[PDB]
Design a protein around this ligand. Structure first.
Ligand SMILES: [Mg+2]
Ligand SMILES: [Mg+2]
Ligand SMILES: [Mg+2]
Ligand SMILES: [Mg+2]
Ligand SMILES: [Mg+2]
Ligand SMILES: [Mg+2]
Lengths: 334, 335
């Protein structure tokens, strides 16, 4: 039975420039207070939340957003991390109820009545989104949030059933529980563009999005395996692989690490394949894929600034790459 | 040397689902043909080809319990879909997006949408009648999966323009949307007078039964329609995809898709056996929906040999002897 594992080196390979929005510090602090208020955070969660640093993630992923747009992005990211953590303790029925409240607020903030914190916060940041977002990325945001909730209901069912999914079913569902897709809609929003359907749904752009989704998500599976195995959460490629393929822990970890390198190569390979829709649209496409690039480098690095995955030891673990497994809530041999 | 023929896997002689036929089939079938001919302005030779399609008969087998008015909306859609598919075989990517814009505009506003395009005028005709009784859930599933269909066919059209045979993994993903099975499934709800709630119909076991049904209907179509599609070297078909990716010969790829077809019917039964319960009212609506999926499997398999679309006048002979004589290519392969 293993007590630790070695992190694949994903950061030293990546040569994209790491940027940080000039508006980062005041917006991050303000959004921290918006979340504590909106989720009614109390200890212990409140202190854990102050080491999340989603505002600093968001500032690295949308480094050119103006202050108004950045704050909508950060509020969403704080809301998303809070929503994720809440839903880790929801059953299937209550997941659908939360889906109903939040999508109701996104689609009809004026007419949708609700007194739930999830939906109240949803109206707050999304009614600020709606002041500027184009109709295309508005609907991509709502539709991919819908996909998020549907997939997390499937995760909640697997958890209640004590199931570990098979690999090809996991990958399919995980692309939606990650939440990367609505973050992509925020790229458009925060850059002040609204890509046409025939551009955004072209297979090469769709493939670059997926490549980015997989990079962020499968690397998150590596970085977050430690906090997730505490409660034997199997919505993570590592236990999925271990069960399906008989891999031990480091074997599974290394297999996922290879997948991560391979998806950045996929991203660059499709980047070369991009067609041209003339100068104005080509320039908006470049802006969008730079946002996908910023998600790649930004998230990889932020995972070690946050307290969420490595506690206080983030910068230290970035250097020596050894992860000591946390104690399980219930011992494996209980 | 290159093959002139291949052998059809036996897909029908083991399928044990009862084959049903709507009581209203014959008069609805004939009225819809006239609707389509007028709406698409069909002329010869296409008009005579269309009189051998028999999409009304297919539709009456897939929705055998619909009343006459709901059946007629389904048959109009089916005639419109086959017509649209054939038109789009000769559209470029730009014009495909243009058709998509017209038809989705029509679906979303089936009385007020201003258009003079035949594709959209017909969309307004059948979908205005659809919305007279379709629930909000299946209405949006129809529209959104028609959206997915157009997006996917635009990808097909780009592949065709580029001379590209896709890889198998990418092909299967896109093909679940170019088939148009997903909007057919929304019509199961409409035609049964039900409107399943989000938490039921997007439950993973129903979504899996839908995909298993999609895959049966679609991959079996790749087999039946390979002959007509290869005439123009159309590679949006798992058979040329398999030959290119895995070096199989024709019979080997055909046999491979055959095994897949048996495996997806098995998947449907396996998921069927672990359906959850939402109580008696919802459970009855789920059983009604699942029987619709069932009727699509058995109906489409038998219909493919009644139609002239795939085997011309020889479907019943081919169903029994299973030898497919390859049609002449438009341009010979060694040209
Ligand atoms: Mg989660
Ligand atoms: Mg989580
Ligand atoms: Mg995680
Ligand atoms: Mg087609
Ligand atoms: Mg076709
Ligand atoms: Mg076909």
């Amino acid at each position: 039975a293993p007590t630790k594992f070695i992190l694949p080196d994903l950061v030293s390979d990546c040569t994209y420039p790491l940027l940080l929005n000039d508006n980062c510090e005041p917006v991050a602090r303000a959004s921290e207070q918006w979340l504590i208020a909106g989720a009614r955070l109390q200890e212990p969660r409140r202190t854990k939340f102050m080491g999340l640093l989603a505002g600093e993630l968001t500032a690295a992923c949308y480094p050119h957003a103006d202050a108004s747009h950045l704050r909508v992005c950060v509020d969403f990211m704080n809301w998303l991390f809070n929503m994720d953590d809440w839903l880790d303790d929801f059953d299937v029925d209550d997941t659908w109820g939360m889906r109903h409240c939040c999508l109701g607020a996104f689609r009809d903030p004026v007419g949708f009545e609700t007194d739930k914190l999830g939906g109240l916060m949803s109206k707050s940041f999304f009614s600020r989104f709606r002041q500027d977002g184009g109709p295309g990325c508005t609907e991509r945001f709502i539709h991919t949030m819908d996909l998020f909730f549907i997939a997390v209901a499937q995760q909640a069912g697997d958890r209640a059933n004590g199931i570990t999914p098979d690999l090809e079913s996991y990958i399919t569902v995980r692309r939606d529980t990650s939440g990367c897709k609505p973050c992509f809609a925020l790229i458009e929003y925060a850059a002040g563009i609204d890509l046409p359907d025939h551009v955004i749904y072209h297979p090469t752009l769709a493939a670059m999005e997926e490549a980015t989704n997989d990079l962020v998500t499968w690397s998150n599976d590596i970085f977050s395996y430690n906090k997730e195995q505490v409660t034997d959460d199997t919505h993570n490629m590592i236990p999925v692989l271990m069960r399906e393929r008989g891999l031990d822990l480091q074997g599974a970890v290394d297999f996922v690490g290879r997948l991560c390198k391979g998806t950045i190569e996929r991203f660059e390979t499709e980047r070369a394949r991009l067609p041209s829709w003339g100068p104005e649209l080509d320039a908006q496409v470049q802006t969008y894929i730079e946002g996908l690039q910023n998600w790649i480098v930004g998230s990889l690095h932020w995972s070690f600034d946050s307290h969420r995955y490595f506690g206080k030891d983030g910068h230290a673990v970035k250097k020596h790459r050894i992860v000591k497994l946390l104690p399980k809530r219930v011992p494996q041999q209980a």
